[PDB]
Structures are given as C-alpha cells and as structure tokens.
Amino acid sequence: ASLGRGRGAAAAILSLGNVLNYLDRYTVAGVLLDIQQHFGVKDRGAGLLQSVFICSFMVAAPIFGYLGDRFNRKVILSCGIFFWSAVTFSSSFIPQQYFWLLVLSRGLVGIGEASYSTIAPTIIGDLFKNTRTLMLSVFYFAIPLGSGLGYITGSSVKQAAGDWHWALRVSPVLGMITGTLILILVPATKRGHADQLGDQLKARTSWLRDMKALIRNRSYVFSSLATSAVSFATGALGMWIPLYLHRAQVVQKTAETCNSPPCGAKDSLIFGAITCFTGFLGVVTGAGATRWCRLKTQRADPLVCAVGMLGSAIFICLIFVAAKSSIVGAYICIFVGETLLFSNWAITADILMYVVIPTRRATAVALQSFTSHLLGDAGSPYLIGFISDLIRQSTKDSPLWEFLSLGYALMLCPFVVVLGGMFFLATALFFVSDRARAEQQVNQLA
Ligand SMILES: CCCCCCCCCCCCC/C=C/[C@@H](O)[C@@H](N)COP(=O)(O)O
C-alpha cells in the first residue's frame, strides 16, 4: 500500500539534512578573518581551505555515486552524516601551530559532503510526477537557505561567544541527532533500480563510446563551459566577499580594527540575508523571463542566460568601484548582481535536458558536474589569494593597500562572467540545430 507519514517525514528530514549540509559547508567561510588572524596565514592559506574542500568533493562524488548505485543507501548516508559531523567537531581543537592539519580536516569533510548530495536526491526519486517535482523543488531550494543560515550562525556565534572556535562546535551537534532519524525514520531500505528486466542486464552501454559523442555536441560543450565560468565566479565571490567588505569598512574608518570589538559581524549576517532572498528571487525571475520569451523565439533560454550574464558582469564590475565611497551602494550592487547571476540556475539544467538525448542524459549530469568543478571553484579562491599576495608583496603592508589589492585581485571575476556570457551566446548560435538533430535521431531510432 501507500505509507502514510513516511513519505513526508523522509522528505522533511532530508531537506533539513541538506540545509545542515550547506550550513556546515559555509560556516568556515563565514569566519575566515578570525582563522587568518589566529593561525597567522596570508590570503593563500585562506583560499587553500575552500580549494581543498572543493577538490575533495570533486574526487569523492563519483565514487560515492557508484557505491550508492548497488550497495545499501541509508547506512551510507548515516555514516557520511556521522563522519563529517565528527570531523567538524574535532577540527575545532587544533592549536595554532598545525594549520596544515586543519586543511586536511576540510578534505575529510569534502568526502562526507559528497556522500549526501550524490545519494540524498535519488532517494526522493524512489518515493514519489507532480509530487516528485514539488519535493525535488523544495529539496533544491533548501540550498540558498542553508548557505544563508551558515553565514548567520557563523557570524552570530563568533559575536556572542567571543571565540571563533564555538562557530565550529554548534553546527555538527544537530548532525549527530539528524542522522539518527535518517536511520530510523526513512521508509524502506533500497527500492527501484530494477531497470534490468528479464535478465540481469538489458541496457549496459559502454560509457566511453557515448561519451565520444558528447564532445561533438557544440551546444552541450559551450553550456558546460558557461556553467564552469559561473561556478568559478560564484565560488570566488562567496569565499572572499565578507573579507573584502570588512576591509573596505576598516579602511574607510567606520568601526575599529579587529579583536577590539567582535570585529565584523553585521556584514556576514546582512550578506546571508541577501543570498537567502536572492536564491528564490533569481530563480523566479529567470523562470518568468524564460516563460515569457519562449513564445517569441526558439532561442529564448540561451539568449536570456547571456543577457543575465552580461548584466551580472556589469554590476559586479560596478560594485568594486562603488565600495570605495559608501557601503549601501555596494549592497545594492551585490543584490542586483546576485539575482542576475543566479537567474540561470534552472535554465542551465533545462537546456541540458532539452539538448542531449535521454539515453546518455545521466552521463552528462555527471561529466558536466565534474567539469563544472574542474575549471570552476577548484582553484578560484586559491588563485584570488595568490594574486592578492603577489600584488601586496611588492608594496608596503597597509590596510588601505590590503583593501586595494584585494579589490584588484577580485576584479578578475567579471571578466570570467563576460566570457561565460559569450559562451552562452555561442550556445544560442547552435542550440536550434543541435535540438533538430537530437529530435531527428530520437524519432528515427524508435
Ligand atoms: C556576487 C556574490 C555571489 C556569492 C554567491 C555565493 C553563495 C553560494 C550560493 C550557491 C551555492 C552553490 C551553488 C552551486 C552551483 C553549482 O553547483 C551549479 N551552478 C553547477 O551545477 P549545474 O549548473 O549543472 O546545475
């Protein structure tokens, strides 16, 4: 029959788990300045944490997908929850003379994180058409809320407690509880995946050969490159914006220097507020623009993406010169650029599913993702830190020069955003032809 409360309890528990996952992910970028001051490292060391975390997630995701494909799922999910909760809790006890060890800790988290985002969504697909679409929408909309909460709790715990260590100790406790219910309240153990009807295999393919066709898809390649550029920009900005804002506030002499008060606390909370509102706002505006423009021409999605990218690049270029005088203009530019940047999220997946044939579709959702991390946020924070260090090395160490060097280094992101917009325009050039070829192939194969 139909399980009464299980299909709702599982969805709610997994949504809470995803929120906690992203909160754990961003709680270390929330308080980066305190880590920098305590461990005595420069910008390169600051970016190394996020770079290592993203690299570990990159490596770990396909292996955990493979493991969850055939082995048990709920035990793997609970083990991952417990593992990164324990690692995060233990990472707060490291002294100030073993900074490298802390970096290693992030890598371990980067493993456990990959055990969730690759396995948690598919369980939803087991349990639910319209209901499945609504659940999946809620599950994916849990992301910006999680990032915002990560920022707010990090900053607020740093302010109230007076020590950044606590910011890494209250997050995983909720994990220790959460996984427990995932082990006792998730209905069933493993269902579905019974596509091998008749015998033990019906359609195994060969992975590589179909991949050989994927390079021949110009629209798919260009869209993947544009997604990689977007990931680069988002990772760099999300890692480095709060520190930039704090330095801009300290050079202008609004508040005192760090460690006399609880340093920068309102900026991170405010930034969490904008990102929390902006995830939803950007998704809504992108969907509405696509819906309106679909009835006027067949190239609505990539042209809309390109226009949004150009606008986001313009506003991201504007904020850097606007932040010198006042901060309200900087926040307004953050808002506008945030919406214009995240307007493309759903449209990217829509065009991906709309171009490539269903049979290879799953493979694309893997490969692109890997590329979306390979040229994106794998080394973007490290690159920004390295450029900032190189600029500051040939100049005297002053707060104003620190802020100016960070701004000049961050100026790289709008160039990449413009490149992504150009790539989306290239996608729009060939989208119709690729769609026609895919339609002909899928119709004539039957
Ligand atoms: C201007 C300030 C910007 C600061 C924003 C940082 C806040 C982070 C919120 C978003 C959290 C990560 C979003 C994930 C993006 C990638 O996974 C997708 N674009 C790639 O997957 P695919 O495209 O294939 O679906």
Residue numbers in the entry: 95 to 222, 420 to 737
How is this structure described in the published paper?
Due to the amphipathic property, S1P cannot diffuse freely but has to be transported across the cell membrane through active transport. Among these transporters, Spns2 is the first identified and the most extensively studied. Human Spns2 is a classical MFS member with twelve transmembrane (TM) helices and a molecular weight of ~58 kDa, which is small for cryo-EM analysis. Here, we reported two cryo-electron microscopy (EM) structures of human Spns2 in inward-open conformations bound to S1P or inhibitor 16d.
We determined the structure of the Spns2fusion construct at an overall resolution of 3.60 Å using cryo-EM. Notably, Spns2fusion was mainly expressed in the plasma membrane and maintained a similar S1P transport activity as the wild-type (WT) Spns2. Notably, an elongated extra density in the central cavity extends into the C-terminal domain (CTD). This density could accommodate one S1P molecule well. The affinity selection mass spectrometry results confirmed that endogenous S1P bound to Spns2fusion. The phosphoryl group of S1P forms extensive polar interactions with Spns2, specifically residues Q463 and S464 on TM11, and the amino group of S1P interacts with S326 on TM7. Compared to WT Spns2, the double and triple mutants of S326, Q463, and S464, as well as alanine substitutions of Y246 and I429, substantially decreased S1P transport activity, but other residues showed less effect. Intriguingly, several positively charged residues, including R227, R456, R119, and R200 are located around the cavity but at some distance from the S1P binding site, which may participate in S1P recognition and translocation during the dynamic transport process. Residues D118, R119, R200, and E207 form a hydrogen-bond network to stabilize the local conformation of NTD.
